[PDB]
Write a structure and sequence with these properties.
1 chains, 51 residues, 2 helices, 2 strands, binds potassium ion, binds magnesium ion, RNA-binding
Length: 51
RNA sequence: CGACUCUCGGCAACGGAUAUCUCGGCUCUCGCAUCGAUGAAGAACGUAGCGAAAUGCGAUACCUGGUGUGAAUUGCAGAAUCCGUGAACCAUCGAGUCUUUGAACGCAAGUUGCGCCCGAGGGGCCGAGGGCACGCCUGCCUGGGCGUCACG
């Protein structure tokens, strides 16, 4: 396919950027235990974000 | 005299009739002609400092932009703004955005399951982003058959 015009002309922007992936951290008592016991941060993340 | 039953009146209950209403209904008349593969109608999930629904909107998410008007919104709180490119849960619309779906279109489907191609940008690797259904029309490219021939 070598089209005579592009069907989409908008570049296409990454709407699932880092600010959508990392919404906010968890601050519950269980989540705070993970910080000093297992060097772990708990985050609320987007549903579309994989590991 | 007392209890019980029945009965008459006064006050208090129970219940929601009556009366007066009404941003609703019903009937009639008029004007207009505008949905969708440029993805509709419908369905799902999200979205507010405090929201569940209804209403609105779509990761730009009770809204962005333009224009108009011209000082509010308010249930609470905080911010912004005022002789101004300037408040508004204001009006209107030409600029935008518009998740998962659905005629629904890579293949499926009680699955966010199973594939292939291109590709900014940082040989290979990692990519943001995007393509790949069916029928049909015009043109085009690559082909098949001694089907009809011509010359070698
Ligand atoms: K009585
Ligand atoms: K009445
Ligand atoms: K399967
Ligand atoms: Mg509303
Ligand atoms: Mg489908």
């Amino acid at each position: 396919r070598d089209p005579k015009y592009p069907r989409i002309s908008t570049p296409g922007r990454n709407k699932l950027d880092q600010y959508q992936i990392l919404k906010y951290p968890l601050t519950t008592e269980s989540a705070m235990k993970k910080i000093e016991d297992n060097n772990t941060l708990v985050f609320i993340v987007d549903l579309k974000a994989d590991k």
